[PDB]
Amino acid sequence: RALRVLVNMDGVLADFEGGFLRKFRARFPDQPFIALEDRRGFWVSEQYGRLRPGLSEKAISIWESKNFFFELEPLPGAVEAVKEMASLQNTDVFICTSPIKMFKYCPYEKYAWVEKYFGPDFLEQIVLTRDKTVVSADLLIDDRPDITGAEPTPSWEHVLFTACHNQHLQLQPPRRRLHSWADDWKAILDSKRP
Amino acid sequence: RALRVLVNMDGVLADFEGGFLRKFRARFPDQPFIALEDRRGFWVSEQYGRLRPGLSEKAISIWESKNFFFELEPLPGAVEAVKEMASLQNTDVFICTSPIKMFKYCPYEKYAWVEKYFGPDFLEQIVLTRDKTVVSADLLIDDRPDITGAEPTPSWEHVLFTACHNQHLQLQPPRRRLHSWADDWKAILDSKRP
Numbered sequence: 226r227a228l229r230v231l232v233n234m235d236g237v238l239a240d241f242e243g244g245f246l247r248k249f250r251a252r253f254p255d256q257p258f259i260a261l262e263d264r265r266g267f268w269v270s271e272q273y274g275r276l277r278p279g280l281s282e283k284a285i286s287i288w289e290s291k292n293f294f295f296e297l298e299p300l301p302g303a304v305e306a307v308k309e310m311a312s313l314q315n316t317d318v319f320i321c322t323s324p325i326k327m328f329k330y331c332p333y334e335k336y337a338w339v340e341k342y343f344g345p346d347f348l349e350q351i352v353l354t355r356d357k358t359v360v361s362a363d364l365l366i367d368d369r370p371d372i373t374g375a376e377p378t379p380s381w382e383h384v385l386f387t388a389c390h391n392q393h394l395q396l397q398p399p400r401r402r403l404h405s406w407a408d409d410w411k412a413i414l415d416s417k418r419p
Numbered sequence: 420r421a422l423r424v425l426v427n428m429d430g431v432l433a434d435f436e437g438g439f440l441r442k443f444r445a446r447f448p449d450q451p452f453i454a455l456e457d458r459r460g461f462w463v464s465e466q467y468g469r470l471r472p473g474l475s476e477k478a479i480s481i482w483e484s485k486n487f488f489f490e491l492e493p494l495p496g497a498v499e500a501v502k503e504m505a506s507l508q509n510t511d512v513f514i515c516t517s518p519i520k521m522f523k524y525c526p527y528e529k530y531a532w533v534e535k536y537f538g539p540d541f542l543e544q545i546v547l548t549r550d551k552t553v554v555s556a557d558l559l560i561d562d563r564p565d566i567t568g569a570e571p572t573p574s575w576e577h578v579l580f581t582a583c584h585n586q587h588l589q590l591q592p593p594r595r596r597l598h599s600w601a602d603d604w605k606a607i608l609d610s611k612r613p
């Protein structure tokens with residue numbers, strides 16, 4: 226009866242792409258980098274790998290570092306929108322995020338970040354999973370174009386959240402975007418209600 | 420098409436009740452304790468709270484401590500059964516566990532424990548959530564009797580895994596138990612297949 230919305234963390238709430246570029250440039254000032262307008266394809270490390278040998282591993286070392294996830298800046302409007310969304314009648318919001326392979330810091334820091342921006346009570350809304358298709362909901366707002374896993378027919382409609390890496394992608398017509406948090410997310414939610 | 424089984428961590432894979440009692444008795448040797456045969460009700464801290472003032476907070480301090488989750492012993496047969504289960508044709512296994520409120524160690528250590536007992540590739544199967552009803556599957560094997568949340572009609576059948584705290588409970592007849600990992604878990608899975 227309550228509409229259930231899964232909101233992705235990196236690329237939707239937290240500015241992974243911007244945080245990564247800043248920290249990559251500071252740590253590796255003599256390496257070439259990819260400006261955000263030139264990002265293509267979901268995986269940062271894949272595009273850096275194509276740019277030169279060794280750069281995939283150096284990119285990965287940025288997000289494996291302590292405080293990388295914790296120090297990510299919220300995307301404009303994201304905290305405000307999710308706070309409002311969760312406060313809506315008949316609306317349950319979960320934050321659905323996948324941890325990286327190296328798990329020393331990342332899970333912890335994601336909990337710490339949600340506490341910092343949404344408060345202790347919002348920690349109850351976090352779902353950490355590598356497979357988003359096994360989480361059931363009406364909507365999934367997520368910047369990754371292709372979201373697959375063990376469930377061939379997910380219950381959610383995936384709404385693509387615009388990010389530098391996907392902004393040029395033509396989607397298969399049924400598929401829909403949320404262009405930013407300034408865009409009309411309430412209309413998207415309402416289209417799914419009874 | 421693949422049968423999806425959610426296997427709970429504490430009380431099913433990891434011996435939380437035994438680990439807790441041992442560490443509580445070592446840290447607080449002059450306090451009364453609850454032998455496992457006398458445990459009743461899911462929440463350890465609630466029963467300790469009834470035993471005397473201040474004991475809820477002392478119990479909580481055990482599982483909030485560094486290395487509590489990591490050092491939990493697997494329950495008999497649990498690692499072997501889950502390894503076999505995941506290897507079965509047309510069978511996907513996820514480990515579904517809720518973190519405690521204090522998140523400094525617990526998420527991290529749960530990933531570390533799964534790596535230790537199941538290997539790096541099994542980390543892909545972990546689902547960390549406070550609300551298990553929003554995870555879709557055919558089965559949930561979990562020692563907690565009452566599992567509720569945002570989804571009023573979960574897709575899974577909850578099979579109650581026997582634990583000291585629930586072993587005397589009469590269930591509402593449709594409901595089923597897995598009595599231990601030595602019990603016939605394959606028959607339970609097969610009853611759900613096409």
Ligand SMILES: O=c1ccn([C@@H]2O[C@H](CO)[C@@H](O)[C@H]2OP(=O)(O)O)c(=O)[nH]1
Nearest residue numbers: 234235241267268269270322323324325
């Ligand atoms: O190039 C990358 C690499 C990683 N990630 C975030 O980390 C999760 C695990 O790879 C990815 O699933 C994603 O986290 P999420 O969007 O689920 O919070 C990126 O965002 N971009």
Ligand SMILES: O=c1ccn([C@@H]2O[C@H](CO)[C@@H](O)[C@H]2OP(=O)(O)O)c(=O)[nH]1
Nearest residue numbers: 428429435461462463464516517518519
């Ligand atoms: O008395 C207690 C207190 C906590 N827990 C485990 O920690 C999660 C959060 O409370 C509880 O959900 C449970 O973890 P899970 O079974 O999901 O791995 C217990 O097991 N017993």
Ligand SMILES: [Mg+2]
Nearest residue numbers: 233235236368
């Ligand atoms: Mg993302």
Ligand SMILES: [Mg+2]
Nearest residue numbers: 311312313316
């Ligand atoms: Mg609400």
Ligand SMILES: [Mg+2]
Nearest residue numbers: 427429430562
């Ligand atoms: Mg349990």
Ligand SMILES: [Mg+2]
Nearest residue numbers: 505506507510
């Ligand atoms: Mg299998």
